[PDB]
Structures are given as C-alpha cells and as structure tokens.
From a paper:
Cyanase (EC 4.2.1.104; also known as [name] and cyanate lyase) catalyzes the decomposition of cyanate into ammonium and CO2. We report here the crystal structure of the cyanase from [name] (Tl-Cyn) at 2.2 Å resolution. The structure reveals extensive interactions at the subunit interfaces in a dimer, and a decamer is formed by a pentamer of these dimers.
A decamer of Tl-Cyn is formed by a pentamer of these dimers, with intimate contacts among them. The active site of Tl-Cyn is located in the C-terminal domain, at the interface between neighboring dimers of the decamer. This suggests that Tl-Cyn needs to be a decamer to be active. Malonate (Mal) is situated on a two-fold symmetry axis in some of the dimers of the decamer, while two formates (For) are observed in the other dimers. The carboxylate groups of Mal are recognized by six hydrogen bonds from residues of four monomers, and formate has the same interactions as it has essentially the same binding mode as the carboxylates of malate. Specifically, the carboxylate is hydrogen-bonded to the side chain of Ser127 and the main-chain amide of Ala128 from one monomer. In addition, a unique feature of Tl-Cyn is the Tyr14 residue, which is located in the center of the structure and helps to reduce the size of the central channel. The structure of Tl-Cyn shows substantial differences to that of E. coli cyanase20, even though the two proteins share 40% sequence identity.
Residue numbers in the entry:
A (entry chain E), B (entry chain F), C (entry chain G), D (entry chain H), E (entry chain A), G (entry chain B), ...: 3 to 161
F (entry chain D), H (entry chain C): 2 to 161
C-alpha cells in the first residue's frame, strides 16, 4: 500500500509531481525503494516528488531508470529550481500534518527557550538541515513514529 | 544567559507564567536545573512555564521549593487544566519558531507519505508524545541542534 | 431524494468522488444501502465518498459491484492515502454544517471542562473514533437528529 | 482536580465567569456537583460558566447558594441575555476543542448527506438542542468519551 | 432589462445555474414571470437559480415548461440537495449586497436587543423563514425598496 | 421583566457612553420600548444608538438624561461628535441570532440583487437613507414569528 | 501605448471584458477615443471595460461601431446588471491602486471629520457619484494627476 | 456648532497626542476649519494630524498650543518624532463613509490605472508628494455634494 | 543550471511569462546574458519575465532576437501596462523570498527610524528605484549575497 | 528631529523599548550617536530599541552610560533573548515600511532567479546577516536612500 498523488485534489504542485507519482503508482514502488535507488533518504525523496527539493543530474538519471521515464522528459520538467512551500495550505487541514503544526504551536517557545540556553541567540537552520522518519515498536506492542530534525545552529551576527 | 519572559510583549499566557518566570529570572536558574529539580524533561518544563503543560502535585511542590514561590500561590495559579495553543500567534513571527513551521510546510506531505507507507492510514500523536532537544558537534567543529519528535501511531478506526 | 454531487460547485475533492457519486445518482442508491453492502456505517461511507476515508481492498470490490464501476477504475482512482480536510471551507457556509461548527464554538470550553473533570488532561481522539446519525421521533411527533461522537480518551504523556 | 478559569489567558468572557469560577475553585466543586444543585445538565452548566447560556432566576439563587456568592452580586452580573460565541477563537487552538473542529471538517458533508437522505432539506438545530458527555470503558479497560448532539430537525420552508 | 448570469465572473454555482439562466435569457423572462409560473415567490425563485434553494418535482416540471428545457435535463442537474452559501464571497464586494451586510453590522446588536426584549433568549430562524421584496413610491415620488424578513422564533432549550 | 444589558468585559470597542447608557438602563429596569417612546425614535434605532451606532440629537440627549437619570453634562460630553459605526459586530458574527441575519445575506444576496435589479434597474437599496423595525407575529397555530422590515431609498447609479 | 487586458493574469472579469479589450487592442484605441464615441467619461468607460458599469443600449451600439463588434454579440454578453467589485483583490497589490488605498487609510478619519463638520452625520455616496482624472503640469514641468470624487451627500434618517 | 470629537475608548492605537488635541478641541468648541486657518494648513491635513497621520512643524506646535490652550511643552514632548501612519483605519473599513471611499478604489481602481497609464505611462500617482481637499457644492435642486480632490505627483518607474 | 518557470505551480503570471521562460529554457540562457543583450539590469530583467516590469519597444525586439521568439508574438503578448504584484502570494512561502519579508518584519521600524533621522518625514521610493544583487567571497572563502535597494527619497508634502 | 516612541500607538514591544526611547528623547540623542557609543551600526542599534536584537553585557553598560539609565534597570528589562517579529503588523501599514514590502512582492522571484543562477539552490540568510542604510546624492542634486542587505549564502543540504 503505497503513497500516490491525485492532482484533482492537490493543486499547485509542479507538473513533474504528476509525472513521477504516476510512474511510482504504475510500478508500485515505495519511497524506500526509490530512495535507495537514488541515494537519498526517504523523506527527501518524497519531498522531491512534492516539488520541495531539487533533483541533481544523477537523481534525474536514477529516477528515469527506476521509474521508466525517459531522461529528456525529466530533464525538461525538473529543470531550474524548486519553488518551495506551496504543497501545504496553512493552517494544515490534513490531520497528520496538523499534528506537526500543533507541536510547533504548543512547543515553539519551549524549544526556543531550551535552544537559546544551550546555544544562545540564533536559529536552527531549516536549510542546512536533514530530517528522517523512523518506525518503532515497544515492548508492549505499541507503535511509535520518530521524526528527527537536525539543523545547523546559526548565531545572529553582531553588526 | 538564561531564558526570561516579558509579558508586555507576550500576551495571553497564564498569570502563572509571569510568576514562574519572574522567579526563574531572579534566581538565575536555567531550565536544565528546573527540569532536573522536577523530574521532567527540559522542553516539557519550558512548555509548562509557557502555559502549555500541567503541573502534577509533586511538580507544584518542587517548583515552589526551587523557585521560592509559596506553594499556596502555585496551587491557586496552576489549578485546573491547561488551555494550550495561545503562546504562538500563527504564522509564527519569531525566526527560530518560524523555521519549525517552515519544516512542516516544506516536509508535511513528505512526512505523511513516508509515515503512510510505514504505518498505513493514521497519524502520529501530538498527545501521546514526547520530544527532546540535543546538541551535536561534528568532526568539523560546527554545532547542530537535533530535535526529536516521538508520538504514538494511531490508525483510523474502521466503523 | 438521494444525495448527489456536482463538482462545479464543490472543488478539490478527489477524482473518485465524482466517479462514485455519479454512479450512486445513476443507480438512485442511498448511503444507507451502499453502507450495508460495504460493511461500513452510513456516515463513514458518505465520508469515503467525499474523499475523507480510505477504501480497503474489500471496499473497492464491493463498491465496484454495487455501483457498476470496473474494479480497475476504482483501484487506480482510490489508491494511496486520503488527504483529508479539503471538503469543507472553514468557516462552513452550508447552514447545516455551520450549525455543527456553532456547537463547537458555543460548547467547546464546556466540553473541555466536563471531559477534563471526567478523564483528566488529554483529548477525545478524532482518529480512534466513530460517529453515527440516528432519527428520533418524540411523544409529540417531532423529529430530532442525534449525532453521536465516540472517541478514545488520550491523556497527555508525562516526559 | 477540577476545572478552573484564569481570565489572563481567556479574554472576553462576561464578568460573571470570573465570579462563578473563583467561587468554584475556592469550594473545590466539580461541574457534576454544581449541575446537580441547579437541575441542569453538566455541559449546559459549564456552558453557562463560560457565558454561553442564560441562568434562570432559580439558577441564580441556586448558584448563589452552592457557590457562596451573595445572590445580589450574581443578579447584577447575570442579567440580560447571553452574547454567545466569543469563548472559542476560531479555528480553535486548544487541542481537545480542535478535534471537535476537525470532526466537523472531515465529516461535515457526510453528516449533511446522511441527514438529507433521512430527513430531507433542512438543518439539525443548534438552538432547539441538548448535548451530553458520557464515559464508556470497553471490555479491554480503554476509556472513550461519548458526546451526543440532539437537535430538532427543521426543514426549509416553501415560500 | 432582466437579470442574467455570466459564470466567467461567478464561480462555484451549480451547473444548473448556467442552464436556467441561459434559458431565462433566451426567452427574455423576468423572475416575476418565472415565479408566478412555478408558484413560488420572486426572491425564492431567484435564490433557486443561484443554487440556494431546492426545486420540488412540480418546480422542475414547471421550470421545464416555462424555460423550454427538457424535464430530464433538469432532473439530472437539479437532483440532490442544495449546498447553500457559495454564491456570495464574504465580505460582499457587490455594493447592493454590501449594504445588506452593513445593516447586519450596524444593527445586529440592536436587532438582538429588541428581539430579546420581545421574545426572550433565542433566534429568528433563517430556515423556517420567508422573505419578500416590495417597491413603495412615496408622496414626493421617491422610490424605496422594502425587504421583509419573516422568521420563526426559536427559544433556546433548557437541558 | 427581562431586559437587554451590556457587559463591556465581553463587548469591547463601544463608545464610553454605551456603558453609561446601558448601566442606567439596567438600574432603572427599562426596556428599549420605553426608552424609544421617550426619545421619539424607534426601538431598533434606540438600541442602535446605545451600541454606538447612531448620533443623539440635542433633544435625544435631554430626553435620555431625563429617562435614564444621567446628568445632562455627562451625556453632552460623552455623546459629542459623530458616530464611528461598524465596530460592535466582529465579522463574521459569532452571536447566533446575529449570524442568522448574516446567513440570510449570504444565501439571498444575489436573489435580492436580481429581484431589486428587475424592479428598479442598476443601483442600490440605501443603508443610510433607511429605516427598519421589528414586529412580532403570532399565527393561527400560535407559533411566534419575528418580522424585520428593511426600508431603504432606491439609488440608481449615475451616468457620467 | 494603450491599456490592454490579459485574462491569464486577471481573472473573474465578465467574458465581455476580453471581447471589448481584444477589439480595443486590435484597433489601437485609447479610452479617450472610445469614451468620446460613447458619450461617457474616460474613467466610466474604462470601468465598463472592467465589468464595473453597465452599458446602455446606445453604449452598446456605439461600442459596436467603434470596436467593430456586432451589436447582437455585444448585447448577448453585456446584458443584465453589473456584478461589481471582483476586479480588485483587496488589499490591492498593484502599486498605483495601492496608493489610492493608502490615501483611504491615512486620510479616512480626516475626511470623515471634515465631511461631518461640513455636512453632518452621513456619507458621500459612491453610487450617486461621478469621478474624473485630469493632468496638471507645474512650473518646474512636473506632472500631477488630479482625481476628483463627486458624490451626493446622504444624511442618516431619523426614524 | 456640531464639531468632530474623539473617544479613544472606541478608537485604539492613536498616539497619546490625538486625545490631548481632540479634548482641547472639544473644550473650545473649535471646528477643523478654524484650527486649520490658525495653523495655515488645509482642513483635511489638519484633521489628519489630529489622527496621528501627519507631522506638525515647530510653527504648527506653537500655533496649536495657542489656539487650543495647551502648554507648548506638553505638545512638544507628545508630538515629537515621526508619525507612524496607517493604524487609524482597520481594513477593511467598517465605518460607512470611509467604506464608500474604499468601494470607490475597488470599483474604479483598474479604471483609474488604465486612464492614468494612457495619459502618463507606466508609473504611480504619489500618495506622499500629494495633497487633498474637501469642498461642498449645492446644485440647482438644492442637493448637496461632497467633492474630494486627490492631487498627486506622477512618478514613472525607473529604467535600470 | 538556469532559472526556469513551471506555470502549473505558479499561477496568475502574464501569458508572456511562459513564452519568455520557455525560450530561456530551450536556449539554456542565464539572466545575466539576457540582461546584457537587452541593456537592462539582471534583476530588472528577471522581474520583467515574472510580469513585474514593462518591456520598451527595443526590449521586445532584443528579447525576440536573443530568445528566438517571433517579434509579433511578443508585441501582442507584451502590450499594455504591467499589473504588478500577483507573482508572490503573501506571506511568502518560498524560503529565500520569506527571508526578505522577515528582514522587513524585523528591521522595518529600525529602517524607518534611521531614514527619518537622516532624511526627515517621507519614504524611500519603490518606483524611482533600482536594485542589484552581487556575490561577495570573503577571506575565509564563505559566499555572501549582497542586495542593494536604491530608492529616491520623497518627503511628505505640506498642504 | 530624532526618532521617538509612543507606546500608545505601538503595542507589543518589550518594556525596555519604552525605557530606552524615553531616555533617548530626554537627551535628544540620535541613533547615530547612540550607535557610535555602543559599537554597533545605526540600524542594529535602532533594531535593538524596538526589541529586535540582543544587548551584550558591554552594550548594556554603554547604553546605561550614554542614556543615563541605571545599569541595573537595563540588566533586568533586557535579560533573556529577543522575541523578534512583533514590531511590524503584516502587511505593513506605515508607508515607508510598506514600500519595502512592495519591493519584496515585486522583486521576490527576480531576486530568487538571479540568486539561484549565481549561487545555486539555497537562501540568503537573515540571521548570519547585516544591513545598513546610507544617504546618497546624485549629479542633479537628488537624494537617494540606499539599503544594503548582506546575508550569508546557505545551500540546501543533500540528505
């Protein structure tokens, strides 16, 4: 049971999102398999499919191969640079993504306070950054999602 | 350099937020020490101070002792249940917090797709949930903040 | 008189909402009947028609046969995972749905207080959850609608 | 462990909300107890404390005696007619109340379709209406909250 | 000079609004004439054309006859239940409609206060309701529009 | 017995005189019917004035002082100047009764426009050169209905 | 350099806007020449092109003649009544238009106070109204744009 | 005799000096016409200043002190610095008179742009290098009309 | 690696935006080369491509020639006056642009104070205005982007 | 003529903004002077007064001295970390600040294009960043405001 895309309900994504997701659906591939094939993490590979990351030339050749899309089709639809941020309309209505938003809402200042006392005045980068999703089962049989955010600490300049 | 609160700029927190923070600032206490005193994680303790968590009866006694605030004051001001979600006006303006929001915006559907392929149709709980902040220094000497989200997977029911 | 869908006035539903509802109108089926044939409740069945639930493999088969739609059409249209939340533009403008919104608005803190006193600090899940609609005619011949919401109580973690 | 109010974080409730809850907190009363004394349902009683219902003359004498508030103070503050709808800032930020909102959002059209097929063109009233909260414990020791909405069906007129 | 519709500028109406309005234009009919033929009031009839009312089986027949649209086209386009509320983007931009909104704004609490003193705690229904438009010409020769709203008084239940 | 009141803790951004007028209304247990009869303005208009949405004439000020027991100099100062209408209802209206009127506008707006366009041409019904009232109707069955009448001057668009 | 319209960038204008503007572009006509031909001011004439005015039967004939569009085609597209207010998305993003909005913002209460002192309690009509644009060139040869607003004074009724 | 006044209970986020000026304006029964003539600015401009929407020159401060009877030292400390324009009107305007001006921008905006574009080219009419006035005409049928004139400097977009 | 446009994700640009970018993409041209060819600044050139500047008759000729587009296509698509301001939905969601908005957010009043103290009461024009982007490489080999805003000082008039 | 603050019109600044600005007005200090005393630029120094920067310990001693405020008052009011982003309500209403917002709107995608072609996929940092304001005079005697943004280029990571 694999993630698919229906652009009837999901506007403003790049044309290649449809192209990639349609080939993904035809071949019944998971993002884990595609990720492995392109040498990028699962989340980043899915982010790429939603228009939220940039395909290197190697990614383009690797996707063409595993998805069965001719390279020239990807080179022309996946050219230039990502125009990030249109995939999620805020505030999020999708329940799973809403919970992530809720976490920011209820822990924002808590995270800021802790980060500030650990690092000082600055931010955790969302650019010089990686993230991953893991699945875990505990001893009682409960399942847990573990999302890790790892971003570079950037102090505010002094000028 | 410790985290503090000025309610002139930060409205709609509980009255206890000012009472707790004023006392944190006057004792020059870090959230690390307060968290260790109360047996709760740093983020959670910070969250409590911003009105975003509930103090147990033991938390009240322990906060009273380390902050030098009489127990009867905390009991009255920290009674009832938290009314979460007013501390961050959306979209966030504060840069640090904004970066976390941007993460949800740019990765939301990537996260969903990966989580759906690993767990099926459902959510990661923001309720049955924990989070932590850690610091990593890499071999190159640069600092990284690592924020971990860990929430129970809930499938949608069939009914 | 049965419920139908006109996508001219109702955007951002999946393509399959159109496919399903046109077959429903063509056969003159009610949701009560469709529901008995898939093994899901009336409300859930209608939520699935509006893109707000996921069809199991058996749902797709049983829908295929009650609606007269080729199994392969529903398998490509109803693949992957729902992207819930787009079917109602908030605040709701349709009067009936608006009343449910108004109830949230006028009772939401009341519910919270009562739930908090009965269960503690937590939520009633909307994921591990079910709902029904029933009709009652009272002693005096007046009709009432009865919506039941049944959600799992989730306490906040201590961490 | 009872519900309390801190108007610092919860603006635009009537003055009597503060008077009622301060007495409630001082006497350590539950809404269950207060409701029993005034002969009203628990939810309706809590609604009344948030300025979302009107107290009859008997409700005022009874609230006055159970809460130990001089009856003439309540008479001056609880006069007139409620000005409902200000207690919940939309969309709701408090997580418990948000889930009720998300329900409306994900089930709105579903409820409308089922209700239309059972009653015709009209609404479930939110005025000629009652509601309740019950606790169920299923055979596996898991708690569920059950919220019942019961509103009069009103058909649209023909004119 | 009769009312027309151009969907180029008015989105989110049902497909049927175009069909009715095109036939209305083809036969140069006024809403007065159509209303008389279907036995409904002018305002109701116009609302119907904008997707804001339900056509009874008799209305569908009479509409077909007076507009020259085959009864089968109308039955298929006008099936199901109205999804009211999308015709006017709020706040209204069309000046005539804006003035109605300015009245609600400037008189809303006035109407409530006077309604409340006359009827008690409740609402005037917009469901169990009728409305008309009349033209008065005074003795100085000035024309006045008179809009009447007639709604059933509904008191809040005691529960 | 049961009269309209104002609690400014829940209702911000009204003129200071709204509080003053409404507190004297409450003390004296007056209805808007009675106050209207004293000042010579209709019930709805009177209530509107109290919510900051109308301008008291010099006679209004004297008559409100009299009927309300407020010294004239106090109304004179508090009710000087010109109303700044539009702040009493935060849009969209949250109060159910008021929301119902907004719902009417929402669901009948274009129907009204179409009917008024066919009877009067291109223009508007004025909300300025305008009156309104509330009546009660009890039908044969004993059911109670509220009847709100909107009476506004027809203004055609100019031609230039 | 004449004004033209590109509907790719400017949605929700009536279909006739395109029709008129395409002819305007084809014949290289200014709004001055068209205005002169129809016997209306330039601003009015442009307003009409943007769907914000109603053409009389003579306007239709004159437009037809000057633009080379058959009378019947224009009549079929320009009948009924204007549905004003959709051409400018608020707040305006186009800089020229934004400056007029800023004028309203920074002079609104000023204008109201001066109008109130001159005329009393009321409004300047935007309906019984006309407007023009003129060009002045001063001593140093700078151009100034003069916009004149002339609207009927309407006092609030006493009722 | 019926003069504009201000009640800050209902009108937030104006500078402290708005209340100072308007309270003195009310105490002396001054019109903006009279204040404006005393300070040598336009009536509109003078009202805009009272709403915190303009800057008083040092001469303005002296002349306001004198005509309003407020000590010069008070006005200097309150009226110091630079205006922070644009807080006086919550958008969209709910005040009806102000709303009509907003509806004019809405309904005429692209018309004004087209006509301006054809007369002047690619550019704006400034709202900074700008003046405005209010005048009253009375037509042959005794109807009154408000005439608002906006006069702004044309600025072409640069070529770079 | 050049900037391209995909209108699937970027609505409400003029028709010519697509025409110009498609040609830029097919010839693999940078904005620096196009800018050099038409004698305009790089930033100004890219702004023209997104519909935010006016092409002179020479620009239309030079663009047509360097891009390999029929001059008559550009003459007609690039007619009229720009309707600036639709290319960025506010608040910006694209991270790079968002940083510019955050700068305005965090330094706006600081800029205002410093500009006021150096020039008096007025604005920096965004109309008599130029801007540029430059790359700086420091001693440690870190790259910096330097954006210069150069606008005419316009004092407020005295009237 | 120096910049001052009136908190009556400017809410949500830290308490220290009032304290610093009032001292500034009492001493008739310009930001240029205060900046030179603390060893930061004018813009940074003004940002500090509006709550948008953090004072170092030397800044506090220097501010105290040039402004005449007891070091101890500044130490308690200026403790902790800035909570940036509240000083400007978006979109900006103040005309000067609005023009900067209008530049972001009209040049946002242009900057992004040119930045992308010069640096690749990334952002200009607003954290690792400085900015200045300069006054310039041209050949003709015209005054120009020059705002420089200098931010660190951050590429998106590959993960």
């Amino acid at each position: 049971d694999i993630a698919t895309l229906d652009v009837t309900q999901h506007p403003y994504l790049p044309a290649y999102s449809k192209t990639l997701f349609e080939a993904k659906a035809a071949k019944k591939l998971t993002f884990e398999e595609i990720a492995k094939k392109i040498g990028r993490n699962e989340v980043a590979t899915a982010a790429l499919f939603y228009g939220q990351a940039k395909a290197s030339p190697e990614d383009i050749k690797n996707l063409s191969s595993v998805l069965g899309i001719p390279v020239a089709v990807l080179e022309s639809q996946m050219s230039g640079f990502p125009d990030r941020g249109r995939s999620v309309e805020m505030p999020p209505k999708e329940p799973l993504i809403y919970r992530l938003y809720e976490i920011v809402q209820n822990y924002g200042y808590a995270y800021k306070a802790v980060l500030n006392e650990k690092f000082g005045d600055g931010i955790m980068s969302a650019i010089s950054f990686s993230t991953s999703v893991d699945k875990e089962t505990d001893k009682d049989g409960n399942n847990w999602a573990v999302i890790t955010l790892r971003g570079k600490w950037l102090p505010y300049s002094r000028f």
